[PDB]
Every structure is written in structure tokens, then in C-alpha cells.
Amino acid sequence: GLFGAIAGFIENGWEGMVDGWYGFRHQNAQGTGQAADYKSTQAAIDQITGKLNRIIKKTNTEFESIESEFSEIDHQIGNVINWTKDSITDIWTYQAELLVAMENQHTIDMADSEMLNLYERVRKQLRQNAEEDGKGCFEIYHACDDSCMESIRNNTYNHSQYREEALLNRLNINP
Amino acid sequence: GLFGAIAGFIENGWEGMVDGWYGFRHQNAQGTGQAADYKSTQAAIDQITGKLNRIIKKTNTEFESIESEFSEIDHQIGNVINWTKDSITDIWTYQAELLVAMENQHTIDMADSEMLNLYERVRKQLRQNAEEDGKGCFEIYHACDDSCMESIRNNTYNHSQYREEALLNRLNINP
Amino acid sequence: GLFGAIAGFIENGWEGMVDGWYGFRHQNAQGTGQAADYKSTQAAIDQITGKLNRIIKKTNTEFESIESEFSEIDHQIGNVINWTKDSITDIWTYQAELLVAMENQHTIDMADSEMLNLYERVRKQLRQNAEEDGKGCFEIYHACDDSCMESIRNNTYNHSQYREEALLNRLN
Amino acid sequence: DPDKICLGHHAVANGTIVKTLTNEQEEVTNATETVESTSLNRLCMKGRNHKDLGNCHPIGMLIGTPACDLHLTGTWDTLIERKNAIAYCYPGATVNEKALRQKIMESGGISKINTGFTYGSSINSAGTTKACMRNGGNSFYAELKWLVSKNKGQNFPQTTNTYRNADTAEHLIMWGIHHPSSTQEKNDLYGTQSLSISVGSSTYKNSFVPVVGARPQVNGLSGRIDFHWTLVQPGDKIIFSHNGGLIAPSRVSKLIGRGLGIQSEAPIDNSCESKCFWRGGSINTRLPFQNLSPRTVGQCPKYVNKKSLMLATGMRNVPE
Amino acid sequence: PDKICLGHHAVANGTIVKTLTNEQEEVTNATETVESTSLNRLCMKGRNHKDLGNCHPIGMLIGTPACDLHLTGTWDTLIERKNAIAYCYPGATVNEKALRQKIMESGGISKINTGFTYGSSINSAGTTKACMRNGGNSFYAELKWLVSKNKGQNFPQTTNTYRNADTAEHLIMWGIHHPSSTQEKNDLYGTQSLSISVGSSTYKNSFVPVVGARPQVNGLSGRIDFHWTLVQPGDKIIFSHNGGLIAPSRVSKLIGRGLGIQSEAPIDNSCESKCFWRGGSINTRLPFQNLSPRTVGQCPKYVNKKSLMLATGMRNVPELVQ
Amino acid sequence: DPDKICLGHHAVANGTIVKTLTNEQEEVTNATETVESTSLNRLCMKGRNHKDLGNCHPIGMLIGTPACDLHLTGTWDTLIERKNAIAYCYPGATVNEKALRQKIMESGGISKINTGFTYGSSINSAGTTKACMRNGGNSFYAELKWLVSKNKGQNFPQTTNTYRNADTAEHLIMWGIHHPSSTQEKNDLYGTQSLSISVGSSTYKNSFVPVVGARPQVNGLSGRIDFHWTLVQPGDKIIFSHNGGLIAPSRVSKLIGRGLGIQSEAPIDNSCESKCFWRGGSINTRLPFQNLSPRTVGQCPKYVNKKSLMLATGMRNVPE
Numbered sequence A, B: 001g002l003f004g005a006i007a008g009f010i011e012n013g014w015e016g017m018v019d020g021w022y023g024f025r026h027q028n029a030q031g032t033g034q035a036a037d038y039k040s041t042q043a044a045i046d047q048i049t050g051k052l053n054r055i056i057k058k059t060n061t062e063f064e065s066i067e068s069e070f071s072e073i074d075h076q077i078g079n080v081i082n083w084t085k086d087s088i089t090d091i092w093t094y095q096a097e098l099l100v101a102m103e104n105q106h107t108i109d110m111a112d113s114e115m116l117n118l119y120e121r122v123r124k125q126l127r128q129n130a131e132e133d134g135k136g137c138f139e140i141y142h143a144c145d146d147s148c149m150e151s152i153r154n155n156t157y158n159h160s161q162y163r164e165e166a167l168l169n170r171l172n173i174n175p
Numbered sequence C: 001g002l003f004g005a006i007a008g009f010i011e012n013g014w015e016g017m018v019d020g021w022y023g024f025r026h027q028n029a030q031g032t033g034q035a036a037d038y039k040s041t042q043a044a045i046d047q048i049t050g051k052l053n054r055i056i057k058k059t060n061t062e063f064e065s066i067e068s069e070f071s072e073i074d075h076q077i078g079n080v081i082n083w084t085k086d087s088i089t090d091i092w093t094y095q096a097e098l099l100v101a102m103e104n105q106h107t108i109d110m111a112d113s114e115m116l117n118l119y120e121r122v123r124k125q126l127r128q129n130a131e132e133d134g135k136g137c138f139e140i141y142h143a144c145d146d147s148c149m150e151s152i153r154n155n156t157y158n159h160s161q162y163r164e165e166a167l168l169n170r171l172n
Numbered sequence D, F: 001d002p003d004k005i006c007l008g009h010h011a012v013a014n015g016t017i018v019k020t021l022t023n024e025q026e027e028v029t030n031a032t033e034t035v036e037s038t039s040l041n042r043l044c045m046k047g048r049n050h051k052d053l054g055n056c057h058p059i060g061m062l063i064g065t066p067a068c069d070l071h072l073t074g075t076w077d078t079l080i081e082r083k084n085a086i087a088y089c090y091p092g093a094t095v096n097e098k099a100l101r102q103k104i105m106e107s108g109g110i111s112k113i114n115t116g117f118t119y120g121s122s123i124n125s126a127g128t129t130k131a132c133m134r135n136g137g138n139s140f141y142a143e144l145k146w147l148v149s150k151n152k153g154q155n156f157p158q159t160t161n162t163y164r165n166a167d168t169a170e171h172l173i174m175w176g177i178h179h180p181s182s183t184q185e186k187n188d189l190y191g192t193q194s195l196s197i198s199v200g201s202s203t204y205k206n207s208f209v210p211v212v213g214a215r216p217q218v219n220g221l222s223g224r225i226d227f228h229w230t231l232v233q234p235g236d237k238i239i240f241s242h243n244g245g246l247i248a249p250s251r252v253s254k255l256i257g258r259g260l261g262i263q264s265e266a267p268i269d270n271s272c273e274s275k276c277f278w279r280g281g282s283i284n285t286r287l288p289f290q291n292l293s294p295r296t297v298g299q300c301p302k303y304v305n306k307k308s309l310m311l312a313t314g315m316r317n318v319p320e
Numbered sequence E: 001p002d003k004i005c006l007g008h009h010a011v012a013n014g015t016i017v018k019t020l021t022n023e024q025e026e027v028t029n030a031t032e033t034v035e036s037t038s039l040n041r042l043c044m045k046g047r048n049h050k051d052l053g054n055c056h057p058i059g060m061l062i063g064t065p066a067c068d069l070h071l072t073g074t075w076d077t078l079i080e081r082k083n084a085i086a087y088c089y090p091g092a093t094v095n096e097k098a099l100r101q102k103i104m105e106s107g108g109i110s111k112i113n114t115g116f117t118y119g120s121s122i123n124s125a126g127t128t129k130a131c132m133r134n135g136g137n138s139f140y141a142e143l144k145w146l147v148s149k150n151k152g153q154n155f156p157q158t159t160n161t162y163r164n165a166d167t168a169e170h171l172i173m174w175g176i177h178h179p180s181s182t183q184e185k186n187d188l189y190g191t192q193s194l195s196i197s198v199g200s201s202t203y204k205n206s207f208v209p210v211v212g213a214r215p216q217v218n219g220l221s222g223r224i225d226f227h228w229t230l231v232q233p234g235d236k237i238i239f240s241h242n243g244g245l246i247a248p249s250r251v252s253k254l255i256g257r258g259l260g261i262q263s264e265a266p267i268d269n270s271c272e273s274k275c276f277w278r279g280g281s282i283n284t285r286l287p288f289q290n291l292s293p294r295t296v297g298q299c300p301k302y303v304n305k306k307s308l309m310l311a312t313g314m315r316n317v318p319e320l321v322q
């Protein structure tokens, strides 16, 4: 898709993640874990709620009858009414189809963008302490326990704390 | 937003940048700098001007009166005209609302993309001589004076010139 | 453009590439070469095919005549028909103009994104063994012969084999 | 050897299919319908001073057909017309009938005002018919009088009657013309003289002649009574001059305010509210579109020729 | 070092399209969405069609000589031509526009005998030089011109009744003759006051021949005007008259539905189409057309636009030219 | 420690709120209006050969009502009709009036052609009325003649008048039928005989009978003159046969070309130009939409049910 993450470099979604739209899975010495990301999830949900608020509505214009349900209509006027009503129905049917097709394209691509934005936030946070594997994971070149993993998820990870250790493991370089 | 820069990793805009839409601030030994980027600014302005040229116009169709202002009209023809006019008004009100909502979404996201494309241009220019701080800035690991800063803005920056100095500082192995 | 590759950091297109929409050129000690990329090309083409299937179509509604070609119409109803038909024509002309303008914008940007997605795939494959030059190329810091270049194009390049060599050359 | 943090997104086992600009079968995690397919099979009349006409046709309210006896006057914001409702107990029709019905169905009430018309001793003003039964006997339209000669065969006298609108709003006046089935019948009711009816106001002028002609029996009757109408402006007079054949108004109507006219087959429900009505009942949807009928009244979703149109409310579904 | 370069294709000569932000955007390829060309012919393959030629639709019901080969039939498509003949004798039909549209929406016509017969004092074989058939004076084939057998004598008070014995409604037409003068009126119908009454369960009207001075149309100041109604299943319609009625010998039944086309373009049975206009047929897969707003059938929508190009490729960024 | 370069974008102190697909209150750096809310309270007539009818009703131009004396002929590209304009000085109306008014308001001029009608010694063709005053004297419609018997009470003669269209374009002919207030009046003007007017061309015919009926006084007059009209094709004749009650044309009309009919109360302004007009004046906007009125004429922005629709002309505003 447009932003290359969902149905892209992320191989598949997680059916086990039920508490959010986007999130993290980690692996360290203590074991494995999973957690949803609130900010990216809510960013996507708020945008879809906004679309629904705009789309799920009717006009306030009051229309009256121009066609008798239980009686005959004039033939000349009736053909004009039939042409006009069918022309109006073709317009609304077309507009409905285009609305939902365009909105669906944008919704899918928006969701893709929020996945990428989270990935990009984490990449920049980790700085020179990690490398991308190409599948949506970061290989972290220092011991990163549950508290360290939490700091990455909470956006409080300080790269300077682990930089010396990480560069030694990545590049075999001592200061 | 879609491209993650404006109202994203860039914390806020600069009210003091009045000569352009996008640009650079810098800090070196010589001083503090600010300059607008012409190419990205004009790319955004030209696209918005293009939209305005398409949108700000009316049809050439000449309409005549089908409703008398000062005299009575026939009951059934008048009801059909009222139904038709209100149906056409609902179509144009809907089309106008959708046009401007769609165009505004695209304008905002286009502006976001131009910010990201400038950021990406600078990232690739600097190559291995700088690191991203996550807030839209690059920490440059060599002395980069006013002419050096100007070369980055001009796309004449030569990473090879500074690479040895930069890598020694980045790896913390400067003798 | 939106994704910054086509008419962006890629200076221009290749008129010589006739067997694909996106592809590779390489330069190594042995020589040069060119090859198209199937997956990215097919991704773009399939999306454009999908648009054409959606757009190239008419409604199933059957319309009959409300204006007589060879005889006179009533003056009051005739003016209402003229007003209605012209209003409907203005709506369809506007909708057609907006449809094609919007679809063209999206087609161009979709094509741009597929260029970028290929570029990003290659970047992540090469990992710490290469550096971006800013013009759509990657400078590879180990000897990468024709078989090595083919493995990049085929998505079977394993960075770990060349990493030690590449990091030695990148740092010195 | 390195520790790992992996970024991801959710998925579901069974996704929902939607259409996009580029793909007719795109699977997403969730979607919601935008075209309403369901209707409430009642007329939701809560918050409305409504009138269900039953077997009374709107025009019958003005002329006083027996079926309309409970609907000769009143006020309402919503007026409900039913299928096969009765306007004409005696065979006939109204000239400019569609305009008249529309005007009544747009109103918010009817009041009635006496014409004050009187007739000399040689006129029988209490003509009745088997076609219009009321209270176990031959009757006639309640708001009109069938005038005939009291003595059979005698010439109906030249008569002139005037209704003045003394109100500040326009009134609607109706009258009928009887069209006999034969010369003998015409002679018996109105005499051998040439018959003519003229009607004249400041805004209206017309003349009428009873047409004698053989016709099939409708409810055992070859005679016809056709109705005509016009508006009488405030302060204006309307003058009827006639010598046989006029079905004369005893009252005129005043249409009061505005209301919503509904033609529907659905029963009324006073416990629920609605803004949108059609033949089959009420549409209380929040959705922008509907596929129930192109014929609706009130504040309604737009009709589309589509069974379903699903709007994505989630990302692409990429299952494990 | 060694290098691998990513790129995209281009062409020397791109195609211009319009986008949201650019009126002159160059792309590698594009395709048209507005149809500009029409086939100058009525494409009638797979259609049981009837080309009326110089027969006007109303003439099929009354039986004008030009319509002799179109008195009955079935069709899914009915083609009307310019300057088609409805009336041989000077005159017109009341509510003619509604009648023509009913015929042009039909899928065929059947004819049913009225069974109208007349006494010895009526001449039911009135003819005119205006309505020629087989080189002789004739009349509308579905009607009869009734006059007094003896010139100057009062036409007898006559009653004729048509019963619809069918399960579908029938369309009945009749005429009223309006003589050129009082003397002519007296010759044909006598000196008496004339009156024609028509009455069914659903229809009622009365008519009187008028003799006011009017100019000649092909040498005739007389007029025959036509009137029509629908007779419901099981109902009867009674004509009471004493001179001036042009009475029906048959009634019509319109059968099913069909597509009415008004065009001067010639028939072509080797090709198919679902959309037609005055100038011919529109056979296109494209969503829009700019040929005419007046079309019939299943058509692309009319737009006031010469061209709308849909991009089928990326932005064209050609190599530098000196 | 290290030198730094920072990428950024501008902001403004006072942003503008716009609506997007996902946000009803999105703040941007700038935006512009797409719906015009203001109108000029004038009819902008620069570059137009226009006719302001003032007190003259379009139909009055053809019959020659005193209010229309300066509008009997002319050419124009724009015709302006005003409220309460006068068509009929004498009480009455025109049959098929709406179609006639629209024909005139679609035209680009009127030419008048003499009928050449003459009358014998037993006709007085100079009938006038206090309803149609000119310069303080009883007068009549300029383009017609009220024919009465020269000798009061005598039978109006059996008369013929024929107009031939000698032009290559169709001509519009009008005539009136007088309907007297009483039998005594009818007898005085036309005699005791039965009155009949027939009109006949190759494409048209009709007959008329003056009706004597009681009806209210309009400006002190219970009489009526009703107007009728038809088109006489090139080379055709139209024959009037009459013996009392015809109001005969002294001229016929030819509608020239096409023009824009405007119904408005706003004054003329020759300084400025416009392509769009409504009841309240002119709309000179470059914007695609307007919320002034759904009833407009000319080349106009489309009416929408919205106060404002702001189009973003800048990025998201993110202040410091």
C-alpha cells in the first residue's frame, strides 16, 4: 500500500492483539511480551470517528409528494417526473459509490501511515543503538530489560545511556 | 498527519519565519541562523494556486426563469419545480461540502509531504556526518561554519570532505 | 510529489527501460547492467487496471424521450425540461471533471509510492553494508559482483555474509 | 544475540469485504453499512397532531362525502391519506383534481363558513340519492345542495346567489354541475328550457352547460356530478347565476396553515417518532442513503439503486 | 565503491492530463473518458424493430394511407422519422403529445372491431380526395365518415356502443367534422342543431361541429379533429349523435413496452447498440459523451466537454534534451 | 556540543478553522471563502441594451395598456419586469397567460405590424372606457379597437376581418372578447341578436360567445374583456367572423431574437457589469457557490444551503 507498512514490510497482523490497533512485541533475557500503543491507535480511531460523524447524516430539507401513490398522474408531467427522478437517482447512486470508494482508499492508507509513523518514532528514538531487520523489528545491540522496553514504548528511552555498549556490539569499537 | 512531520515529529511551526513556508534554523560557533527554503515553499504554493484556479469558477451555462417572482404559478408544475430545485440544491450543497473537505485534507497532507521531502533531502545529504534527534534536527558531528550550513541549504554539501572528522566524533575515538 | 521519488530525488526516468515501470541499474568492477522489477511494476499496473474497471462503465438505467425532436413541446413544461436538463448536465460535467482530476492525482502519487516502496525494500535489505547517495542509488561497501547484484534484485541478498567487510570499508 | 522490539498491527480471523478506488474485493478489519435496507412498518406519529383519514379522500373533506363526516373540519400538522379512499359517492370527478388534493394535503387544517344561499318555493333544495347513504337513508354531499324543480317537468327558476368573503384570508369554494343521463330526466328535474350556469368573481369567470348523454351505470346511475373550484380572495364576492344543473355550496372551506401530507399503507404508532415516511411506513435511520423507495416525504436519506455499500472502519486485514 | 541505482521508466513524448493541482501534468500514458464519435446509423441487431418511414405514430391508430403497412404488429423498438404524415384531411388531435408518447412507449398494436353499424338513412362510406388510397378517394381506414344519405335531410339520431370484452384497456379514437360553411353543414347533416355525446364509466364529453370561416388547406376549409380515451376492461362507451361524428370501425390495444427513437439515420442490422440519438447510435464503453443531451436507452452521461483524459501511468520525467 | 541544523515550517498567531474529511475543526494558516454571501442591491446593466418596464407588464406591451405606451416596440438583450406591473386597465385576463409572458420575457424585442382592419358605417370602432385613461380622457388599449353598434340598441352587423401574414416570420395576433355586465348593456352595445365570434386560420380555430352574467365591480366595472392569442404562420390568413363582442386588433406583434428576462425590485446601475441576477439585485462574485437565493437567472454560482465553506490555502497551523 501507499505507506508500505501494513500489507507491506509488516508481513501480517496480530490476531492476538485485542486491546489496540498498533503495538509492540519484544524479546529479551527475561522473556517475551506484548503491549498496545495508545497514541497511534487513538490517532487512527479519532480520524475514522471524524469520517463517520460527517458521512452518517441526512439533509434537513423537507420534501413533499410529487407522485400520487393511490391515483393516476398526468402522462406528460409524469414522464418528466420519471426522467427527473431517475436522473437524480443516478447522480446519488454515483455519488454514494464514489464517496465510499474514495473514503475506503483513504481510510486504509491513513491506517498504513499511522503504522509507519509509529515505526519512524521508534527508529529515531533508538538512534545508533539498534538496526532494522526489514520486517518491522529493531534488533537492539544492548541488554534491554522490561524497564528498558517500557521506556521505548513510553517514549522515554535515552539512547546516550546505552550508546557505548551498543557501538561496541554493532561495530567492535571502543572509545 | 499522513507524512508524520507537520503536527508530528516537528513539535511546532515558526512564527518568526515570514519569508517562506519551510526552512532551516541552525547553530554553530559563528552564530544562530534562519533561512527559508525556496523550492519546497514554491512547490506548496504552486499546488494550492492550481487548486484555486480549478475551484474558484462558475459554469458558463445561461439559465432562464422557471418561477415567477411577482405572479401566481400552476399548482402541479410549481410542486415539481420546487421538488426539482430542492433536489438540485441538496446535490450541490453535498458536492460543495465534499469538495472542500477532500481538498482541505489533501492540502494539509500535501504540505506535510513537502516538509518531509525537505527533511529527507537533508538527511541523505549529511550521510554519515550527522544523526537525527527525532525532533526534525540533525546533530552534525564536525565543525560546520556558515559556508558549511549554506552548502547544506544549497545542496552543495560534500559529505566526503568532513567524513573522517565526523566518524571520529560519532564513535568517540578522536585522538 | 507526495512520496518524493518520481520527479523528486530520482532526477529523471529511464527511456531505455522498456520491459518494466520500475527497475535497477548497477555498476561494479566487472561492468554495468539494467533490469526491470516485476513486483513493483505489477503492483502499479494492477491498481490502474482496478481504476479502469471501476470508471469505464455506464449506468443500467433506461431513459425514454421527454423532448420531441420533430414536433413542438408545450412552452411551460419545455422551459422546465430545459432548466432541468441543463442543471443535470452541469452536475455531470462537474462530477466528470472532479473524478478524473482526483483519480489522476491519486494515480501519479500511487506510482510515486511504489517507486519509494521498492527503494525502501532495497535499503532495508542492504542494512549496514551500503549508504544512500541521495539520487536513488546505494553505494555498496563490499565487492558485489553480478551474482551479488542479482541477489539484491531477487530479494535474496543476505547482509550478514558481507557485514564484516562492509563495516571495515565504511569506517576506514 | 541482540534483544528485539517488533512493531505490528492487529488483525481478525474473518475480515469484511469493501470496495476501494483500485480494488473491488479489499478485506478490512471492520466496516459499516451506509445504505439503509430496513423500514419500520408503522407510521411513527409521536409528537405530531395527526389525522388519519381512513376511507375519506381529501377532496371528500371539502364537499362532505359521508365517509368524511368526521373530517369536515379540524387542525393537524400531518394528514394521512389511504388507498381506495372515497371522494365521490355519486358518479363523477373534479376538474383540476390533482392541484386541489395537493393543496389539501399541504394544509394544516380546514374550517367551514356558511354561504347563506337560499332558494324559492318552486326549488327543492334537498335532493338526495341512493349513492350517498347517511344515517340509514338517501342523502347527499353535506357541504352542497342538489337543487331541482319541486314540480316535475316545470322550468327551474332563474336564480342568483352571492358569497362574500368577509374574512382576512382566502377561502376555497366548490360547486358541482349535474349532467343528466337523458332528455326525459333533464326535463323532469329542470324543465324543457335551455340550461346555463355562470360563475363570476373579481378573479374568476366561467360558464357551464349540463350535457345530456347516454352513459353506462356506475353504482346503478348514468347521471354524473362534476365538481369545480376556485379561491375567493379576502373582501371579494363570487356570484352564481343558474336555471338548473347547479349543485350549490352551502359552505365554503378555509385551509389553515401548513402540514405534511402522507400517502401510506402502514398502521399508525403513537409511541415512536419519525421525520421520513413512505408507502410502507417510517424510516428512522441515521444512514445517508436508502434503497426502500424513490418516493418518500419529509426529511429523508437519499434513494440509491444499491443493495449494500460498506464503509471501512478499520485497516487492511492481514491474517496470520 | 560498487553501486545499485533504483529508477523508473519514461517516454520521450508524454500525454497531458489535468490533476487537482496542475492543468498541464505530463504522464507516460492516458486514455479518453468522453466519447466524441457516433455511428451515423441506427444499429438494430438483436431488435425486432419497426421503421415507420413516412407514417406518423398517430396515423397507425386512425389508419392514414401512409400507415397502411403499420396498422398492427409487434416490436421492441419503434423508429419515427421527420415530416411523418398523421392527417391526410386537414385537422389535429386533441392531447396529441400524450397520445404519441403512449404509442412510442408501446411494444405493438392490435386492432379490435367496434361492430358499429348504421341504418339506411346514413351513408357510412364518406370519402375525400385529401385521403387517397389505391388511386381513389378514400378515408382513414379505422374510421367512417357518416353523412345523410339524402343531401339536405336531417341526419338521424343515432346510438353506437362499444363494449371492451378484453382483459386489457383499449384505446378508442373518434373525429368531429367541422364543415367549411352553413350550406355544406346543411348538405351533409341537415338544418338541425348538431350534438355528439360520448360517455363511458370513466369518461364524458360533448362536441358540436363549428362552421366559422377559415382558410383552405390544400383547397379545403373543412377540419376533422380527433379525440381519444381509454376504455377499461368490461366497460362500454356510448356515442350518441345526429351528424358530425367520424366514428371508429376499430379500436386499438397497445401491447407491452418498447423503445421509441426519433432519428433520420438509416437502419443497420449488422451491428448492435443500447443508446440512440437524432444523429444515430452511440456504441461505447466510456462513462461520458459529448454528442447530445437528448439520448434514449442505456447511455453514457452527457457532459459539456471536448475531452477528459484519465492517466494510466506515472509522471513522465524525460531525459534532458539539448 | 555538536553543531545543529533544524528543519521546520512557518506558523501564524491567528489561524483559520476549516473542515476536512476527518476533522470538523482543523486549524490552518490561511483559508478562503467558496460561498458568496453578499449581493449588490442594484441591477448591473453595463454592456447591455436593456429595457426597464417599470409599471408596464410584458403582456401590456402587446395590447397597449396606457402604462406601456413607451414600450409598444423596441429591441433589447435584457428585459426587466417589476412588481405590481399593470397588464389590464379594463377588468379581465388572458387565456394561456403564463406561456405568453414567458415568450415576451425570452425575446430580444417587439415589432408591430398593422392589421389593416376597416369597418363599415354601422360600426363604431372608437369605443373607450374610464378604466383605460390617457391624459385625463377615456381611452382604450392602443393595439385594439372596441367595436360597438353605431346606433344604440341596433343589431351589430355580421362582419368579417382578415389578416394575412405577408412576412417570412410568424406573427403573434391578440384579440379580446367583451363579456357584458347585463342584458340591457349587451342589447345597447350589440343588439338583441345571439352573439358569436369565430376565429380561423390554417393552424388554429376557435369560437367565442359573449356571456352576460352578474359579477362584482372591479374599479366600478362588472364587464370583462378576456384576451386570446395565436401565432399566424408566414403566408397564412386568419379570419375573424363576428356580430358583436369582438375587441379587434389594429396591429399584430413580432418577437425579435432572444434576451434575458429579469424579475427584480432593484434599481438600474449602468456603471457596473454582471452575468447573474436575482430579486434583490446582482451577483458579481468569482466564487463557485452562493447562499443568496435558489431563484437566479443568467450565468450564476450554484445555490447551496450553507453560510460558509472555507477552503484551506495553507498548512496546519501549529503555534509556539
Ligand SMILES: CC(=O)N[C@@H]1[C@@H](O)[C@H](O[C@@H]2O[C@H](CO[C@]3(C(=O)O)C[C@H](O)[C@@H](NC(C)=O)[C@H]([C@H](O)[C@H](O)CO)O3)[C@H](O)[C@H](O)[C@H]2O)[C@@H](CO)O[C@H]1O
Pocket (backbone or CB within 6 Å): D126, D127, D128, D129, D130, D131, D138, D146, D148, D179, D180, D181, D185, D189, D220, D221, D222, D223, D224
Ligand atoms: C325518486 C325519483 O325522483 N324518481 C323515480 C326514479 O328514481 C325512477 O328511476 C330510477 O332512478 C334510479 C336513481 O334514483 C335516484 C337516485 O339517485 O337515488 C333517486 C333520487 O331521488 C333522484 N334525486 C334527484 C335529486 O332527482 C336521483 C336523480 O334523479 C338521478 O340520479 C339523476 O341522474 O335518482 C336509478 O337511476 C334507476 O335505474 C331508475 O330506474 C323512475 C322509474 O321507476 O321513477 C321516478 O319516479
Ligand SMILES: CC(=O)N[C@@H]1[C@@H](O)[C@H](O[C@@H]2O[C@H](CO[C@]3(C(=O)O)C[C@H](O)[C@@H](NC(C)=O)[C@H]([C@H](O)[C@H](O)CO)O3)[C@H](O)[C@H](O)[C@H]2O)[C@@H](CO)O[C@H]1O
Pocket (backbone or CB within 6 Å): E126, E127, E128, E129, E130, E145, E147, E178, E179, E180, E184, E188, E219, E220, E221, E222, E223
Ligand atoms: C355545386 C357546385 O358548383 N359546387 C362547387 C364545388 O365544386 C366546390 O365545393 C368544394 O367541394 C369540395 C368537394 O371535395 C370533397 C373532398 O374533400 O374531396 C368531396 C367529398 O366527396 C366530400 N365528402 C363528403 C363525405 O361529403 C367532401 C366534404 O364535403 C368536405 O371535405 C367537407 O368539408 O368534399 C369540398 O366540399 C369543399 O369544402 C367545397 O368548397 C367549390 C370550390 O371550392 O365551388 C362550388 O361552387
Ligand SMILES: CC(=O)N[C@@H]1[C@@H](O)[C@H](O[C@@H]2O[C@H](CO[C@]3(C(=O)O)C[C@H](O)[C@@H](NC(C)=O)[C@H]([C@H](O)[C@H](O)CO)O3)[C@H](O)[C@H](O)[C@H]2O)[C@@H](CO)O[C@H]1O
Pocket (backbone or CB within 6 Å): F126, F127, F128, F129, F130, F131, F138, F146, F148, F179, F180, F181, F185, F189, F220, F221, F222, F223, F224
Ligand atoms: C354607451 C355609454 O357610454 N353609456 C354611458 C353609460 O355607460 C353611463 O353609465 C355608467 O357607465 C359606467 C361605465 O361606462 C363606460 C366605461 O367603461 O367607462 C362608458 C364607455 O363609453 C362604455 N364603452 C363602450 C364602448 O360602450 C363602457 C361599456 O359600455 C361598459 O364598460 C361595458 O361593460 O362603459 C359604469 O358602469 C356606471 O356604473 C354607469 O352608471 C351613463 C352615464 O353615467 O350613460 C352613458 O353616458
Ligand SMILES: *[C@@H]1O[C@H](CO)[C@@H](O)[C@H](O)[C@H]1NC(C)=O
Pocket (backbone or CB within 6 Å): A074, A075, A076, A078, A079, A082
Ligand atoms: C413512471 O414510472 C412508473 C413506475 O415505473 C410507471 O408505472 C409509469 O408508467 C411511468 N409514467 C409514465 C407517464 O409512463
Ligand SMILES: *[C@@H]1O[C@H](CO)[C@@H](O)[C@H](O)[C@H]1NC(C)=O
Pocket (backbone or CB within 6 Å): B074, B075, B076, B078, B079, B082
Ligand atoms: C414552492 O415554494 C415556494 C417558496 O417556498 C412557495 O411559495 C410555493 O407555495 C411552493 N409551490 C407550491 C405549488 O406549493
Ligand SMILES: *[C@@H]1O[C@H](CO)[C@@H](O)[C@H](O)[C@H]1NC(C)=O
Pocket (backbone or CB within 6 Å): B147, B148, B150, B151, B154, B156
Ligand atoms: C549558495 O547559493 C548562493 C546563491 O546562489 C551563493 O551565492 C552561495 O555562494 C552558495 N553557497 C554555497 C556554500 O554553496
